[PDB]
Write a protein that binds this DNA or RNA. Structure first.
Ligand SMILES: [Mg+2]
Ligand SMILES: [Mg+2]
Ligand SMILES: [Mg+2]
Ligand SMILES: [Mg+2]
Ligand SMILES: [Mg+2]
Ligand SMILES: [Mg+2]
Ligand SMILES: [Mg+2]
Ligand SMILES: [Mg+2]
Ligand SMILES: [Mg+2]
Ligand SMILES: [Zn+2]
Lengths: 136, 134, 94, 125, 38
RNA sequence: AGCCAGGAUGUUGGCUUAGAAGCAGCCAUCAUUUAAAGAAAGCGUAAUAGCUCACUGGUCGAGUCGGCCUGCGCGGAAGA
């Protein structure tokens, strides 16, 4: 379950998720799963999904994961008042803007890939579509 | 109207023959020993196919046909069992003369136009069980 | 062979472009060579179904502008982020 | 399925064996096993006979290739044609005994010399 | 009667229908495929 | 789309199994007569047999198939 080996700082500003994505195109595989909607991907989500589409291909072809959960989220536990600092680090997320490419794939029949990606997207919080790499 | 594949001079065990065509009204021992009297000429150890034809009066007429493509390819390559992994693992060999002998036996037993059509159907059964044609 | 019909753009900027895109038309450009650049507009559909072939990118096509053809190649093309759409095309004089 | 090119080539093959053939017999193919049909295909390659089951509106296009055009009303109903490229007869003598052997289908109308022969007079061939 | 908010064809004999503004899935073959939306 | 017809030989392909015969499982999946017929898409057997399908000929007679992009609606939808 992905997570930065080591970081400069332990915690982060909530920040915003605004504007559109970079890496709109499929640069490695023949096919890719692109995100239409905008949202935060926990590492758990990405892992579960990668699993789903790994079962789906019977471990053939190849799978890239283009997104990384590099920003730490915190939570104060239950029954704790406000203040007294910033909450402890719960988990990691990747900010996703419309038009990012979450996974790439190739070495597989197209039909099968659309399938595997449907099964992968069942595990994801955000609106997604199927896409093909193009010439230029 | 039934079919079985029975070893050369053999008949009347319980699981292979007796019940199968015995629930159809057929007398079991006349089939058994007129089939061992006909197929006494087939070599020991080859299953030979027999087509049993039953009529409303239970008197039957069977055409014993020539041994299978797979059995004559077991014997013409010398082997016992063919491949469990055909054309991946290859278990024996036959020159085109054995393809043509097995396909004269089966020239009596095929739908083929020429001995090249019967040699090609025995070619097909030669690629089925893994055997090499050389 | 691909033939694209086009009109000369009387306007420019973000506003012009987004009114273009609302009307189911889209802006593109023709540069390269001794000449000056020529900004033109196209029908989104025709071209979207035309670049739905591969050769579109490897070949010399023609563009009909005010009675006058130019022969060009496809240089680079920016697509809308998630939509089956085209924001723009760089045409380089062939 | 069959593309227009497919149909065109096949019309060319039926028209091509039709030009080369001495005599033909059109028949009903319905209600008979592929066992007895491969039996009349063996009895076919043995008699020199070219056996076919071909589309009707395809055989109007191939038989427009002359002089079998008297057969274009014999193409209503399922069509199995026997062209004897070697000898005339041996189709018309083989089919009546195959249809009396099976007692299925029909064997409707023949063609020879450029004329059609009605079903009870195919005993001419 | 599987009653749920996602209803599908579970084989080739399942046929979708809208009766009285409900989407159901009806099978001739397999009583177990009988579904209603809800 | 419907309705009539056929869905063949080698062969029960070999492996394996008390049995696997298109249809436990493993591997190949060729060739023949072909209008067409997967070494078979499902029910079926102790294993067969038995039943449709893929595929093709017939009858029919002019439009039909399913994606893409969007507009408005349906279900998803329970509380004092
Ligand atoms: Mg800021
Ligand atoms: Mg950036
Ligand atoms: Mg300005
Ligand atoms: Mg503005
Ligand atoms: Mg009611
Ligand atoms: Mg139809
Ligand atoms: Mg249309
Ligand atoms: Mg509602
Ligand atoms: Mg309720
Ligand atoms: Zn069903």
């Amino acid at each position: 379950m992905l997570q930065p080996k080591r970081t400069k700082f332990r915690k982060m500003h909530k920040g915003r998720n605004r504007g559109l994505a970079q890496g709109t195109d499929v640069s490695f595989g023949s096919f890719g799963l692109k995100a239409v909607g905008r949202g935060r991907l926990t590492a758990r989500q990405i892992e579960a999904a990668r699993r789903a589409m790994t079962r789906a291909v019977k471990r053939q072809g190849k799978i890239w994961i283009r997104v990384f959960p590099d920003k730490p989220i915190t939570e104060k536990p239950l029954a704790v008042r406000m203040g007294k600092g910033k909450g402890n680090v719960e988990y990691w997320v990747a900010l996703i803007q419309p038009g990012k490419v979450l996974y790439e794939m190739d070495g597989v029949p197209e039909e099968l890939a659309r399938e595997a990606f449907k099964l992968a997207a069942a595990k994801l919080p955000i609106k997604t579509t199927f896409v093909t790499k193009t010439v230029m | 109207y039934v079919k079985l594949q029975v070893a050369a001079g053999m008949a009347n065990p319980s699981p292979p023959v007796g019940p199968a065509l015995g629930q159809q009204g057929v007398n079991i021992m006349e089939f058994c020993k007129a089939f061992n009297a006909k197929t006494d000429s087939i070599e020991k150890g080859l299953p030979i196919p027999v087509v049993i034809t039953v009529y409303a009066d239970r008197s039957f007429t069977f055409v014993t046909k020539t041994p299978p493509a797979a059995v004559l390819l077991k014997k013409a390559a010398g082997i016992k069992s063919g491949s469990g992994k055909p054309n991946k693992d290859k278990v024996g060999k036959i020159s085109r003369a054995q393809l043509q002998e097995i396909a004269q036996t089966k020239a009596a037993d095929m739908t083929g136009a020429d001995i090249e059509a019967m040699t090609r159907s025995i070619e097909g059964t030669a690629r089925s069980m893994g055997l090499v044609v050389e | 062979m691909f033939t694209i019909n086009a009109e000369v753009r009387k306007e420019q900027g973000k506003g012009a472009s987004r009114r273009l895109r609302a009307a189911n038309k889209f802006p593109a450009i023709i540069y390269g060579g001794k000449e000056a650049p020529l900004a033109i507009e196209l029908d989104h559909d025709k071209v979207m179904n035309m670049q739905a072939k591969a050769e579109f990118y490897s070949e010399v096509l023609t563009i009909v502008v005010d009675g006058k053809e130019i022969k060009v190649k496809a240089q680079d093309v920016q697509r809308h982020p998630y939509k089956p759409k085209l924001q723009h095309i760089d045409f380089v004089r062939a | 399925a069959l593309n227009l090119q497919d149909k065109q080539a096949i019309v060319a093959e039926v028209s091509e064996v039709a030009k080369g053939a001495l005599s033909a017999v059109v028949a009903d193919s319905r209600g008979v096993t592929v066992d007895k049909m491969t039996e009349l295909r063996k009895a076919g390659r043995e008699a020199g006979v070219y056996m076919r089951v071909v589309r009707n509106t395809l055989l109007r296009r191939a038989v427009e290739g002359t002089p079998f055009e008297c057969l274009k009303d014999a193409f209503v109903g399922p069509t199995l044609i026997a062209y004897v490229t070697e000898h005339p007869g041996a189709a018309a003598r083989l089919f009546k005994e195959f249809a009396k052997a099976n007692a299925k289908f029909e064997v409707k109308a023949a063609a020879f010399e450029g004329e059609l022969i009605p079903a009870s007079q195919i005993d001419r061939l | 009667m599987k009653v749920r908010a996602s209803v599908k064809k579970l084989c080739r004999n399942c046929k979708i229908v809208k009766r009285d503004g409900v989407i159901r899935v009806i099978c001739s073959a397999e009583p177990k495929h009988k579904q209603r939306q809800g």
